[PDB]
């Protein structure tokens, strides 16, 4: 079992490169089911989940693997299985978005229902209904929801009644196939759903509204192919922005988008962060000042993003002042408080609200990872913090951050992997 | 890793012994920390939890080991270490006991300060409070909760403002030694605080009140030695009436306390049983019958207890009508319902709350368990479920079940333990 090492109080400064947003790559990646030419996505982070996706895309008769330039390269044109193993699934959960393509272009589908997952209650019945008004028939049998349809998929109004990134992908993603029009309101803004639709229609979608809640979809019989840039990813942004806010430094981020994280740099800068935004880059300089306490409230996009709220709790641990976190999205995505109180943190929960007292320091002591982007923090904490610090399962990490040791070493922090 | 192989329906009826309280047989083998003398434990149950708490009482000095009767005997005379160690710590934050009357004997004390768990935030803020007030100074360095006293503790007035098993026992165990006479107010009202409180008694303890909400502990210089019988485990019984339940079965628990499970009797019998009380035993006989759906409330002994939440929300799932189960002492308890619903299960989250749609026949399938008391009902749906059921990461399971699959088998279920 991977641990990471992390060594006393240390200023992190220097430039770091972003990569391509990971829920982005996710969902073009199952996204390219529809695709019957070949397809180049850029830009692609290294990372676990993808490495994950790719083995259920490999077992549907898709050949895809990313060459020596880093790029991927995916062929789809032969796939002959439908099914999305409860084996691969249980790993990640998102690959329930497998369901919505396969049905669209080869009329049938089959994927394991997601169970149980330590930060929520993350039911998909969203997504089961949204292909339901598209035609499809479903049912659950032996732990699989078995999509159906005889014909190709009617487009139709959709109303989401939850604003759901995921359910706005898979719907999104059979309309391009379906017949006549399709039109998605209430749909989720996030940047990654913009990418999607992007990638989608180069090639031959028509997907226009995306970014807003209202998407429309002109269904087209056939999607062919393209070579995609994946969008910047903006949790990978924040939390490196985040690295100089908490220890006072001053970091560059190289290859970001300048637009996609404004909650998050208005909340940087309500702490007492100087942030300058280029179209390319995005730089935080802390002046070597302690952070000032900021309230934080969770909300889809463009809101606060839940994938930001621990970095943000270390934030605030840090500060001077008290402060109000509320979760909306996820209602148990507090696992790493109780894991900073170890360290000297102090806060108190009280169902979706924790109210922390910002301290002057942390103290190094052994943690535990569980959250592939909120665990994150316990990481920066051991950059911070004095002495020696320990951050167990750290494979939880690996799923949602390429590279992090090394990206972390260049900004100064002295962290190394290791096991027993 | 081991997993269980569980077949297809089943009419489980039968006669399954209980064991003793794990809830009781871990305190008091913490507070066992105070004896002087010889102690002799019958009736403990044979699970991890208690393996674990061995391996913590040893390294602090404690000679103990179960003997070929299965009694345990235990010697703390010569405690020489006073630490809990982090490694042993986190695999069970009930270790937090040991701090307690290692410093009210001792005069220091020193636990690893329990990190974050699956099912909820669980601080153990009022443990900390309560035995400051008791004289004690705390503090918290390198992940350590480090107590010391200088001299003998002080009784006072004690107020615990939320109903706390784990602080009413801390606080308990502490009063025992401290001078002058301790009143708990708000005390938890748990059965296995009542047995707690008659072991120590045993030993010389002066402890009245134990079961109500006022808790009375006159102070004495050391407590002795003692043998002791747990009291029977009321979760146990309560699995094991539910199995007969969800079933249509009949089942007889064998040394059973008659009154410590009132909340779930009568739960039962609104459901549709007909249970037998004697005082030695509890027969429970669903007559061939589907139950009949019931609301469910969390909540502080002699209400419904939480730990057996989840083997009710099985029977609301196969239950004729809809059920609302509200969990008001660990908010994020529901990780079995995803896993239920994998299997068949009708339910909605919100919140707190689970509105649950009872069906004929649940199906099986592969699930994970991962709370080592609610899981259990994931065991039971496999029972009861068509074909063939795969319970993942059982291991849980034997933190807090004894000799589980031939109790299960004893009562006509087809379950194997294999791994791969
Ligand atoms: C692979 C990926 O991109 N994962 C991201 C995605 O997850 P995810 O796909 O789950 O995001 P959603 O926006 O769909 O849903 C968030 C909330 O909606 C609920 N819900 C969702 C769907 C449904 O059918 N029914 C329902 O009740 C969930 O239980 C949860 O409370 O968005 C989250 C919020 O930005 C991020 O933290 C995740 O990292
Ligand atoms: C070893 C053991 O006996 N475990 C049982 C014990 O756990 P446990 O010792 O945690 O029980 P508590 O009754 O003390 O507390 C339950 C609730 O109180 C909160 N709390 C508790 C202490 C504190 O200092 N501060 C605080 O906020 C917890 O976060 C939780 O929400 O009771 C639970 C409820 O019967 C059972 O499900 C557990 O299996």
Chains 1, 2 share one sequence.
């Not at 301290?359 to 982007?373: K, M």
């Not at 690996?398 to 992090?404: N, Q, V």
Request: negative net charge; glycine residues 10%; aromatic residues 4%.
């Amino acid at each position: 079992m991977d641990k990471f090492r992390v060594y006393g109080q240390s200023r992190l400064s220097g430039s770091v490169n972003i990569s391509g947003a990971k829920n982005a790559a996710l969902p073009i990646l199952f996204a390219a089911i529809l695709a019957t030419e070949p397809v180049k996505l850029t830009n692609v982070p290294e990372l676990k989940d993808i490495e994950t996706t790719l083995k259920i895309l490999r077992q549907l008769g898709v050949v895809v693997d990313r060459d020596a330039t880093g790029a991927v390269l995916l062929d789809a044109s032969n796939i002959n299985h439908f099914t999305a193993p409860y084996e691969l699934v249980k790993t990640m959960r998102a690959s329930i978005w497998a369901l919505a393509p396969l049905v669209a272009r080869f009329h049938q589908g089959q994927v394991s229902l997601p169970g149980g997952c330590s930060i929520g209650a993350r039911p998909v019945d969203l997504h089961i209904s949204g292909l339901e008004k598209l035609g499809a028939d479903i049912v659950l049998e032996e732990g699989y929801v078995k999509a159906q349809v005889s014909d190709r998929l009617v487009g139709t109004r959709i109303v989401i009644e939850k604003v759901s990134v995921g359910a706005t992908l898979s719907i999104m993603m059979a309309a391009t196939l379906a017949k006549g029009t399709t039109v998605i309101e209430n749909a989720a803004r996030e940047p990654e759903i913009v990418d999607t639709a992007d990638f989608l229609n180069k090639m031959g979608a028509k997907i226009t509204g995306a970014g807003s809640a209202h998407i429309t979809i002109e269904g087209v019989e056939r999607l062919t192919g393209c070579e995609h840039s994946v969008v910047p990813d903006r949790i990978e942004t924040g939390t490196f922005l985040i690295a100089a806010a908490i220890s006072g430094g001053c970091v560059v981020c190289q290859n970001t988008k300048a637009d996609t994280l404004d909650a998050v740099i208005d909340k940087l800068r309500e702490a007492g962060a100087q942030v300058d935004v280029t179209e390319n880059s995005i730089t935080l300089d802390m002046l070597g000042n302690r952070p000032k306490a900021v309230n934080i409230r969770t909300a889809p996009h463009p809101g606060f993003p839940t994938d930001m709220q621990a970095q943000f709790t270390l934030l605030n641990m840090v500060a001077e002042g008290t402060s109000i976190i509320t979760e909306t999205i996820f209602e148990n995505r507090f696992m790493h408080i109780p894991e900073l109180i170890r360290m000297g943190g102090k806060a108190e929960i009280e169902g979706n609200t924790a109210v922390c007292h910002g301290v002057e320091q942390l103290s190094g002591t052994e943690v535990i990872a569980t959250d592939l982007r909120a665990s994150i923090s316990l990481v920066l904490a051991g950059c911070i913090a004095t002495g020696e610090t320990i951050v167990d399962r750290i494979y939880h990490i690996d799923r949602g951050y390429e590279h992090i040791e090394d990206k972390l070493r260049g900004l100064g922090a002295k962290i190394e992997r290791f096991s027993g």
